[PDB]
Amino acid sequence: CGDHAPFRHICRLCYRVLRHSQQDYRKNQEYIAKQFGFMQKQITALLHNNRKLLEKHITAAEIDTFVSLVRKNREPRFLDYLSDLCVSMNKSIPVTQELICKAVLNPTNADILIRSKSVRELAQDAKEGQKEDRDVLSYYRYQLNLFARMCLDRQYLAINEISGQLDVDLILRCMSDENLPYDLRASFCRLMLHMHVDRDPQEQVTPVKYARLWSEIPSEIAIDDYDSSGASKDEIKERFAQTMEFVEEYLRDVVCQRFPFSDKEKNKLTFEVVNLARNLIYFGFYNFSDLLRLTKILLAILDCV
Amino acid sequence: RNIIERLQDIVSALEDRLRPLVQAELSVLVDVLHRPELLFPENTDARRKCESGGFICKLIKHTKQLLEENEEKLCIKVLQTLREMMTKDRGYGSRGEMSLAEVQCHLDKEGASNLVIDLIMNASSDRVFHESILLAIALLEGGNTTIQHSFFCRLTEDKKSEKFFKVFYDRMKVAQQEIKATVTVNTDDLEMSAVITIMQPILR
Amino acid sequence: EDIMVMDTKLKIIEILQFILNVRLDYRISCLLCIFKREFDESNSQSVPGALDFEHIEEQAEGIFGHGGRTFLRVLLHLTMHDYPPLVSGALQLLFRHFSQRQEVLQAFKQVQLSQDVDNYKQIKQDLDQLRSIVEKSESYNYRVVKEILIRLSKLCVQESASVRKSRKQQQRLLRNMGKAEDTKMQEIMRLAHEFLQNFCAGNQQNQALLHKHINLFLNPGILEAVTMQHIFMNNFQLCSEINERVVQHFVHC
Amino acid sequence: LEKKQNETENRKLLGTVIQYGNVIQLLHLKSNKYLTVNKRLPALLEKN
């Protein structure tokens, strides 16, 4: 720096080995960890834990510096890595999340570090058609979602919900439109909204069918649609139904006719949707018919060959 | 008059009584069918014939589960299932002769007994212990001659399981001493628990 | 990604485990509400030779096999080659076949243990249980949490019925009892023992039996004799549960 | 007879290399009395 090649290449892999050694070590990595930040600046803050180490990586200034660099940075992968949202309850609920949100929220707040949406989508398609059109969105969306979503925290997610759009339909359409992250992004957004609704009560499945001598309506012979966690009556129900219908209808069709390896993200989205359905879908016999299809959809996925 | 409700409870009880009478048998039949199917080309399945058709998979899966450990409850159910597969002499009437010379012969054609030697070697649960050999007499399936003849050859592998068997035996010796203190003296019984009872069956 | 699909599908499959679990329970309740008491029981929902042909009558409906394909799908799920995470899922599915029998058990699943009274008990009974659970879960921090177990769930309504076997069934911590320290934990334990005795207070015959079942740190004769005498003596349980040698233990006690 | 048999063991027993971890017995000579610790009969000072 003061004043590349084979030497540089050799040093790169060596740096990777160094990172692994500190990451593997426990009770053994204090100054190596202290050491890591400078190396990061040149080119395990939560990844290796550091209970103490995790807190230490929590140099507020270090986080701020990383964010500023990214903003003027114009270099994306590092931003996602920095973006975190660790397991371990999402990095202690933003013990990581709080920092990222303030830091991410502050940068967004003062900087970057319908019809318009449709126009943007068309522009993105043109960019995709060429080789430098719109290649920032999938990564950006993923980073934003992770950053604004570790572990289902407080209203910082509603700060990201400030950039929400209220559009499950739009998100689903976007994911479908770009066999990508936007659709997956819609699922993530849906999960966040669902989590907010879910704070309401944490809907675990209860097996209490205890109808007393005062018993229930005993004419429920074939309930095709049982009462579930659609977010209340018509609106919640409609949203859940629409999403489910599209996925089964869309997922089922893809599974029946898709290739066995080309939409790993699509499969992941389907799994997320299934989890979401468990949190929210509860529609009975009709739901059960859908479940049969999911059963059918599962069979279609297996239609192994 | 809550008599209608009481009558409903009685009808349910009658149904339950039948359930007690069979579903053990019915459940066994379903499971037995699965065992046969596994031996079977998937009981009319066999991965839709084809390249992936389908013969000997249950045994391979069983070896993997044994290696896995786990919340042991699944393993206990599986141990019961292995016994049920050996657990035979009824339900047949793929015309395999219902004799362990064919059956545990094909079960030794399967040959899943290293896990029982591992169940003899590793004994995590007492229920894992008391059933790891509790069906293990099928390893001596009447002849069990290869199950001997390979099991003796299998005895030359490591120290592991043999040492565990010795510990169980030693465990039986300790238990016997305790029981002797426990019988204590004369001059009735509750079966001496079973610890003792378990040991007698195990010893046999 | 294959297991991300597979255990993702296993997530659906484990979702399908309780999904059909839930479905089976709901179906049972619906069936239970009207008609067929004898007939309904026989029907199910889907001397030595009594059902042995009805099993054969299930044997064609099994050997040939309102979704038959769904049952086959469960078999295909079992059919996956080797997925250790997936293998664990397969083990769950194998137990799940066991679900028809499980469903019979599930039909029974009517046990455990008035109305408004039940709600009040849940508000409290539940509170006492929660305090005990929290104390186990969380020097004296669990001893700081011990007042939720000893004081919370301290005023048991022994006049109200449904408490003896049912609060005995509702009380997991008590069952587990049935870490001694001379400090906050020790004090909490002594208080808990007194409170627990008051709570059990619902075993005059049954309560005594429950206490006996719970016990392992007691009935030696030596280590707890004075306390044992205080807990019980001079009754009909002193004539049948009154076997001797306690003064031989009380000779050291 | 069994006590006689205990002897008709000890005589044979002489020769054994006395090692760690064994379980052995004792006996005096001057008083020629035995050693037995009670499990239920306490001491004079402390009952423990």
mmCIF file of C-alpha atoms in Angstrom, chain A residues 23-262:
data_model
loop_
_atom_site.group_PDB
_atom_site.id
_atom_site.type_symbol
_atom_site.label_atom_id
_atom_site.label_comp_id
_atom_site.label_asym_id
_atom_site.label_seq_id
_atom_site.Cartn_x
_atom_site.Cartn_y
_atom_site.Cartn_z
ATOM 1 C CA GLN A 23 -12.866 -19.557 13.740
ATOM 2 C CA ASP A 24 -12.226 -23.131 14.887
ATOM 3 C CA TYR A 25 -10.538 -22.030 18.123
ATOM 4 C CA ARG A 26 -12.351 -21.393 21.412
ATOM 5 C CA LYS A 27 -10.769 -20.039 24.601
ATOM 6 C CA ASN A 28 -7.862 -19.395 22.267
ATOM 7 C CA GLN A 29 -8.547 -16.532 19.923
ATOM 8 C CA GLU A 30 -8.454 -13.137 21.592
ATOM 9 C CA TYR A 31 -5.919 -11.147 19.676
ATOM 10 C CA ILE A 32 -6.366 -13.017 16.484
ATOM 11 C CA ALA A 33 -9.950 -11.841 16.754
ATOM 12 C CA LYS A 34 -8.791 -8.339 17.588
ATOM 13 C CA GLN A 35 -6.546 -8.728 14.627
ATOM 14 C CA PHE A 36 -9.275 -9.736 12.146
ATOM 15 C CA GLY A 37 -10.776 -6.289 11.630
ATOM 16 C CA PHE A 38 -7.793 -4.727 9.931
ATOM 17 C CA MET A 39 -7.574 -7.695 7.565
ATOM 18 C CA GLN A 40 -11.272 -7.319 6.824
ATOM 19 C CA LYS A 41 -10.726 -3.677 5.997
ATOM 20 C CA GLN A 42 -7.953 -4.592 3.590
ATOM 21 C CA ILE A 43 -10.095 -7.272 1.946
ATOM 22 C CA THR A 44 -16.448 -14.425 12.577
ATOM 23 C CA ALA A 45 -17.729 -11.213 14.171
ATOM 24 C CA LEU A 46 -20.849 -13.293 14.646
ATOM 25 C CA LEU A 47 -19.874 -16.346 12.554
ATOM 26 C CA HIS A 48 -17.387 -17.640 15.022
ATOM 27 C CA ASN A 49 -19.283 -16.785 18.180
ATOM 28 C CA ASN A 50 -17.096 -14.661 20.420
ATOM 29 C CA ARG A 51 -19.544 -14.381 23.218
ATOM 30 C CA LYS A 52 -16.937 -11.890 24.334
ATOM 31 C CA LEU A 53 -15.648 -11.956 20.763
ATOM 32 C CA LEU A 54 -19.077 -11.386 19.319
ATOM 33 C CA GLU A 55 -19.442 -8.336 21.555
ATOM 34 C CA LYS A 56 -15.960 -7.153 20.630
ATOM 35 C CA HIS A 57 -16.590 -7.338 16.881
ATOM 36 C CA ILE A 58 -19.330 -5.024 17.969
ATOM 37 C CA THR A 59 -17.003 -2.122 17.628
ATOM 38 C CA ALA A 60 -19.753 0.398 16.880
ATOM 39 C CA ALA A 61 -17.252 2.422 14.920
ATOM 40 C CA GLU A 62 -16.171 -0.726 13.086
ATOM 41 C CA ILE A 63 -19.732 -1.382 12.024
ATOM 42 C CA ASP A 64 -20.185 2.238 11.016
ATOM 43 C CA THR A 65 -16.967 2.217 9.020
ATOM 44 C CA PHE A 66 -17.994 -0.910 7.199
ATOM 45 C CA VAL A 67 -21.352 0.635 6.369
ATOM 46 C CA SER A 68 -19.823 3.884 5.128
ATOM 47 C CA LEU A 69 -17.394 1.992 2.941
ATOM 48 C CA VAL A 70 -20.178 -0.085 1.473
ATOM 49 C CA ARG A 71 -22.271 2.993 0.782
ATOM 50 C CA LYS A 72 -19.477 4.654 -1.130
ATOM 51 C CA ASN A 73 -18.221 1.136 -1.518
ATOM 52 C CA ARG A 74 -20.035 -0.079 -4.633
ATOM 53 C CA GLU A 75 -18.813 -3.572 -3.693
ATOM 54 C CA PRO A 76 -21.843 -5.856 -2.720
ATOM 55 C CA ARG A 77 -20.924 -9.364 -1.287
ATOM 56 C CA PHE A 78 -19.163 -7.843 1.706
ATOM 57 C CA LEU A 79 -22.321 -5.889 2.489
ATOM 58 C CA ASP A 80 -24.343 -9.126 2.704
ATOM 59 C CA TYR A 81 -21.743 -10.797 4.935
ATOM 60 C CA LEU A 82 -21.706 -7.687 7.160
ATOM 61 C CA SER A 83 -25.515 -7.751 7.025
ATOM 62 C CA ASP A 84 -25.600 -10.861 9.188
ATOM 63 C CA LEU A 85 -28.822 -11.629 11.040
ATOM 64 C CA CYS A 86 -27.133 -14.532 12.875
ATOM 65 C CA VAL A 87 -28.751 -17.677 14.037
ATOM 66 C CA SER A 88 -28.556 -17.845 17.844
ATOM 67 C CA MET A 89 -31.802 -15.971 17.823
ATOM 68 C CA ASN A 90 -30.644 -13.702 15.021
ATOM 69 C CA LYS A 91 -27.468 -12.613 16.747
ATOM 70 C CA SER A 92 -29.139 -12.093 20.084
ATOM 71 C CA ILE A 93 -32.072 -10.303 18.534
ATOM 72 C CA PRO A 94 -30.039 -7.601 16.956
ATOM 73 C CA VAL A 95 -27.563 -7.523 19.855
ATOM 74 C CA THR A 96 -26.777 -7.587 16.230
ATOM 75 C CA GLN A 97 -30.086 -6.583 14.832
ATOM 76 C CA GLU A 98 -30.228 -3.391 16.797
ATOM 77 C CA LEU A 99 -26.843 -2.363 15.594
ATOM 78 C CA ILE A 100 -27.567 -3.211 11.990
ATOM 79 C CA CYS A 101 -30.903 -1.520 11.995
ATOM 80 C CA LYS A 102 -29.646 1.684 13.486
ATOM 81 C CA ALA A 103 -26.618 1.544 11.309
ATOM 82 C CA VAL A 104 -28.488 0.315 8.350
ATOM 83 C CA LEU A 105 -31.515 2.442 9.058
ATOM 84 C CA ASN A 106 -29.402 5.503 9.729
ATOM 85 C CA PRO A 107 -27.529 5.107 6.476
ATOM 86 C CA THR A 108 -30.725 4.612 4.524
ATOM 87 C CA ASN A 109 -32.353 7.507 6.355
ATOM 88 C CA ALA A 110 -29.658 9.924 5.423
ATOM 89 C CA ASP A 111 -28.259 8.471 2.280
ATOM 90 C CA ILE A 112 -27.933 5.178 0.575
ATOM 91 C CA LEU A 113 -25.101 4.496 2.977
ATOM 92 C CA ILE A 114 -47.498 0.570 -8.689
ATOM 93 C CA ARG A 115 -47.058 1.922 -12.214
ATOM 94 C CA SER A 116 -43.537 3.044 -11.324
ATOM 95 C CA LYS A 117 -42.813 -0.426 -9.981
ATOM 96 C CA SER A 118 -44.047 -1.967 -13.237
ATOM 97 C CA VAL A 119 -41.830 0.402 -15.217
ATOM 98 C CA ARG A 120 -38.890 -0.530 -13.019
ATOM 99 C CA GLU A 121 -39.606 -4.217 -13.632
ATOM 100 C CA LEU A 122 -39.610 -3.642 -17.377
ATOM 101 C CA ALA A 123 -36.297 -1.773 -17.076
ATOM 102 C CA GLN A 124 -34.887 -4.611 -14.987
ATOM 103 C CA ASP A 125 -35.942 -7.081 -17.672
ATOM 104 C CA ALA A 126 -34.111 -4.997 -20.277
ATOM 105 C CA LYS A 127 -31.040 -4.883 -18.033
ATOM 106 C CA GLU A 128 -31.222 -8.672 -17.651
ATOM 107 C CA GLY A 129 -31.513 -9.032 -21.404
ATOM 108 C CA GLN A 130 -28.230 -7.139 -21.812
ATOM 109 C CA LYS A 131 -25.128 -7.688 -19.712
ATOM 110 C CA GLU A 132 -25.230 -4.570 -17.385
ATOM 111 C CA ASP A 133 -28.922 -3.789 -16.930
ATOM 112 C CA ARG A 134 -30.108 -4.239 -13.326
ATOM 113 C CA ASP A 135 -27.639 -6.551 -11.557
ATOM 114 C CA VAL A 136 -27.888 -5.110 -8.064
ATOM 115 C CA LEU A 137 -31.390 -6.007 -7.023
ATOM 116 C CA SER A 138 -31.304 -9.654 -5.992
ATOM 117 C CA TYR A 139 -28.308 -9.233 -3.747
ATOM 118 C CA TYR A 140 -29.578 -5.921 -2.468
ATOM 119 C CA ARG A 141 -32.973 -7.316 -1.663
ATOM 120 C CA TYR A 142 -31.514 -10.284 0.123
ATOM 121 C CA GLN A 143 -29.255 -8.094 2.180
ATOM 122 C CA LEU A 144 -32.056 -5.718 3.046
ATOM 123 C CA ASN A 145 -34.340 -8.494 4.094
ATOM 124 C CA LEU A 146 -31.755 -10.187 6.248
ATOM 125 C CA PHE A 147 -30.676 -6.922 7.782
ATOM 126 C CA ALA A 148 -34.192 -5.837 8.598
ATOM 127 C CA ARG A 149 -35.244 -9.296 9.630
ATOM 128 C CA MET A 150 -32.958 -11.068 12.017
ATOM 129 C CA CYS A 151 -34.988 -13.017 14.564
ATOM 130 C CA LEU A 152 -38.311 -11.095 14.356
ATOM 131 C CA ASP A 153 -37.403 -8.085 16.475
ATOM 132 C CA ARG A 154 -39.369 -4.927 17.270
ATOM 133 C CA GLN A 155 -40.552 -2.072 14.995
ATOM 134 C CA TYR A 156 -37.188 -1.794 13.148
ATOM 135 C CA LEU A 157 -38.851 -4.414 10.979
ATOM 136 C CA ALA A 158 -41.705 -1.920 10.660
ATOM 137 C CA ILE A 159 -39.002 0.513 9.633
ATOM 138 C CA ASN A 160 -38.383 -1.979 6.856
ATOM 139 C CA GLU A 161 -42.173 -2.245 6.904
ATOM 140 C CA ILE A 162 -41.994 1.482 6.183
ATOM 141 C CA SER A 163 -40.470 0.351 2.900
ATOM 142 C CA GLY A 164 -43.000 -2.486 2.738
ATOM 143 C CA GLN A 165 -45.544 -1.627 0.032
ATOM 144 C CA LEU A 166 -48.316 -3.782 1.599
ATOM 145 C CA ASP A 167 -48.402 -5.822 -1.564
ATOM 146 C CA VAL A 168 -48.190 -9.538 -1.056
ATOM 147 C CA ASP A 169 -49.641 -9.653 -4.544
ATOM 148 C CA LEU A 170 -46.929 -7.401 -5.865
ATOM 149 C CA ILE A 171 -44.201 -9.401 -4.159
ATOM 150 C CA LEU A 172 -45.520 -12.686 -5.485
ATOM 151 C CA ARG A 173 -45.792 -11.227 -8.942
ATOM 152 C CA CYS A 174 -42.225 -9.921 -8.728
ATOM 153 C CA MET A 175 -40.846 -13.271 -7.661
ATOM 154 C CA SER A 176 -42.685 -14.951 -10.520
ATOM 155 C CA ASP A 177 -41.582 -12.275 -12.970
ATOM 156 C CA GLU A 178 -37.917 -12.691 -12.226
ATOM 157 C CA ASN A 179 -37.167 -16.276 -11.495
ATOM 158 C CA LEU A 180 -35.359 -14.921 -8.526
ATOM 159 C CA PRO A 181 -34.862 -13.122 -5.199
ATOM 160 C CA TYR A 182 -37.748 -10.725 -5.770
ATOM 161 C CA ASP A 183 -40.225 -13.581 -5.471
ATOM 162 C CA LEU A 184 -38.121 -15.128 -2.724
ATOM 163 C CA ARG A 185 -38.011 -11.581 -1.396
ATOM 164 C CA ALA A 186 -41.815 -11.497 -1.434
ATOM 165 C CA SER A 187 -41.845 -14.677 0.660
ATOM 166 C CA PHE A 188 -39.397 -13.158 3.126
ATOM 167 C CA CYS A 189 -41.561 -10.033 3.384
ATOM 168 C CA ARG A 190 -44.626 -12.186 3.894
ATOM 169 C CA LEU A 191 -42.808 -14.046 6.642
ATOM 170 C CA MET A 192 -41.973 -10.765 8.339
ATOM 171 C CA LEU A 193 -45.598 -9.598 8.148
ATOM 172 C CA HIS A 194 -46.747 -12.969 9.431
ATOM 173 C CA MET A 195 -44.268 -12.738 12.295
ATOM 174 C CA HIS A 196 -45.692 -9.356 13.228
ATOM 175 C CA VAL A 197 -49.210 -10.853 13.229
ATOM 176 C CA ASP A 198 -47.883 -13.894 15.116
ATOM 177 C CA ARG A 199 -46.426 -11.753 17.927
ATOM 178 C CA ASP A 200 -50.124 -11.651 18.595
ATOM 179 C CA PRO A 201 -50.005 -15.131 19.969
ATOM 180 C CA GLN A 202 -47.528 -17.748 18.694
ATOM 181 C CA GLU A 203 -50.086 -20.121 17.134
ATOM 182 C CA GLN A 204 -48.922 -23.592 18.142
ATOM 183 C CA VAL A 205 -51.169 -26.521 17.227
ATOM 184 C CA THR A 206 -53.379 -27.508 20.152
ATOM 185 C CA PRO A 207 -54.997 -30.960 20.240
ATOM 186 C CA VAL A 208 -57.716 -29.895 22.671
ATOM 187 C CA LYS A 209 -60.912 -31.177 21.079
ATOM 188 C CA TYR A 210 -62.514 -30.993 24.517
ATOM 189 C CA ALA A 211 -66.191 -30.356 23.788
ATOM 190 C CA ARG A 212 -67.983 -30.667 27.117
ATOM 191 C CA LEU A 213 -71.521 -31.780 27.925
ATOM 192 C CA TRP A 214 -72.063 -28.392 26.445
ATOM 193 C CA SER A 215 -70.659 -29.694 23.176
ATOM 194 C CA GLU A 216 -69.928 -27.835 19.949
ATOM 195 C CA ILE A 217 -71.845 -27.667 16.678
ATOM 196 C CA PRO A 218 -71.940 -31.444 16.105
ATOM 197 C CA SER A 219 -72.794 -31.172 12.396
ATOM 198 C CA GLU A 220 -69.202 -30.699 11.242
ATOM 199 C CA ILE A 221 -69.028 -33.930 9.246
ATOM 200 C CA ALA A 222 -66.688 -33.021 6.360
ATOM 201 C CA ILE A 223 -65.052 -29.683 7.121
ATOM 202 C CA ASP A 224 -63.341 -28.716 3.875
ATOM 203 C CA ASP A 225 -62.239 -25.375 5.381
ATOM 204 C CA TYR A 226 -61.435 -25.328 9.100
ATOM 205 C CA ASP A 227 -60.813 -22.085 11.013
ATOM 206 C CA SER A 228 -57.133 -21.139 10.717
ATOM 207 C CA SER A 229 -54.625 -18.284 11.099
ATOM 208 C CA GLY A 230 -55.534 -16.355 7.982
ATOM 209 C CA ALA A 231 -54.991 -12.847 9.335
ATOM 210 C CA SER A 232 -58.607 -12.429 10.262
ATOM 211 C CA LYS A 233 -61.741 -13.272 8.359
ATOM 212 C CA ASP A 234 -61.794 -12.170 4.790
ATOM 213 C CA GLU A 235 -58.560 -10.215 4.449
ATOM 214 C CA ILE A 236 -56.290 -12.732 6.116
ATOM 215 C CA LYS A 237 -58.161 -15.602 4.574
ATOM 216 C CA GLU A 238 -58.060 -14.168 1.102
ATOM 217 C CA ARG A 239 -54.379 -13.451 1.235
ATOM 218 C CA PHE A 240 -53.560 -16.899 2.468
ATOM 219 C CA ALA A 241 -55.834 -18.518 -0.045
ATOM 220 C CA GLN A 242 -54.480 -16.560 -2.943
ATOM 221 C CA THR A 243 -50.921 -17.320 -2.040
ATOM 222 C CA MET A 244 -51.632 -20.960 -1.466
ATOM 223 C CA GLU A 245 -53.580 -21.293 -4.640
ATOM 224 C CA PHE A 246 -50.864 -19.717 -6.704
ATOM 225 C CA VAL A 247 -48.142 -21.801 -5.185
ATOM 226 C CA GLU A 248 -49.987 -25.071 -5.543
ATOM 227 C CA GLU A 249 -51.188 -24.081 -8.913
ATOM 228 C CA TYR A 250 -47.833 -22.730 -9.739
ATOM 229 C CA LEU A 251 -45.699 -25.017 -7.653
ATOM 230 C CA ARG A 252 -47.667 -28.068 -8.678
ATOM 231 C CA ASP A 253 -47.313 -27.237 -12.331
ATOM 232 C CA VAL A 254 -43.594 -26.623 -12.037
ATOM 233 C CA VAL A 255 -43.048 -29.813 -10.094
ATOM 234 C CA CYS A 256 -45.042 -31.838 -12.564
ATOM 235 C CA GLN A 257 -43.123 -30.428 -15.471
ATOM 236 C CA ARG A 258 -39.987 -28.847 -14.120
ATOM 237 C CA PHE A 259 -36.439 -30.229 -14.313
ATOM 238 C CA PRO A 260 -34.982 -31.784 -11.156
ATOM 239 C CA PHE A 261 -32.238 -29.236 -10.420
ATOM 240 C CA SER A 262 -32.927 -25.748 -11.794
#
